[PDB]
Design a protein around this ligand. Sequence first.
Ligand SMILES: *C/C=C(C)/C=C/C=C(C)/C=C/C1=C(C)CCCC1(C)C
Length: 232
Amino acid sequence: QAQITGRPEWIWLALGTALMGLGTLYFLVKGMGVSDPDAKKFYAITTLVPAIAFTMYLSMLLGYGLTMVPFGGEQNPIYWARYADWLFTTPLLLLDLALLVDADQGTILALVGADGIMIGTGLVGALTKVYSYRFVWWAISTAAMLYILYVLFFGFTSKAESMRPEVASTFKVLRNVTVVLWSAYPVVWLIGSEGAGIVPLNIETLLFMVLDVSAKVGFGLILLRSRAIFGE
Ligand SMILES: *C/C=C(C)/C=C/C=C(C)/C=C/C1=C(C)CCCC1(C)C
């Protein structure tokens, strides 16, 4: 019965793998030249996030990143490999924006640590047997998310507006893309296999695939095609 997996969403997973991989190879066979030590950081950071995502999407495709969790009434398919990805992916995405706005080490740590809680709490939620409690973890995860998005929006903007026109402009486009994409994750989770079965794992997988590739490669293509602070 149970929210069928290991087979339907294979195309989505495979397609995720393809885009992440090509996006990786792209950022690689583009960062060939790049002298500027500042620009060097952005290329490095932004190339690892596709590579992490490639590794993890492969595991889901090949089955390894799938597991079964007892909840609600049945044997529920869960892709923990998402949290393995996101654990390192989402802090690096933050580090790009931190570096771009030259944020204080204080905020950076507060940020990365908070992101740590967001994903960790998410995984605890995803694997929690007791149905009712999954939403306790979702709420906490969403609090960690909205905190991060707050400092990005109401914080990092002001600091950005004081940099260079290019930096303020570039940060803002990214800030927009980030706030929007990130805010989708708790929604698609809550309606998906992982929470209330409004929407099947099949669509849950597809939504996350589109969101993920946008938040890795789409995000990266805004950044690595602009003036990356002093550098290019
Ligand atoms: C490339 C992947 C990205 C940018 C992933 C972002 C992930 C989040 C913003 C996750 C948020 C979550 C919630 C707020 C609730 C349920 C648990 C999470 C981790 C899925």
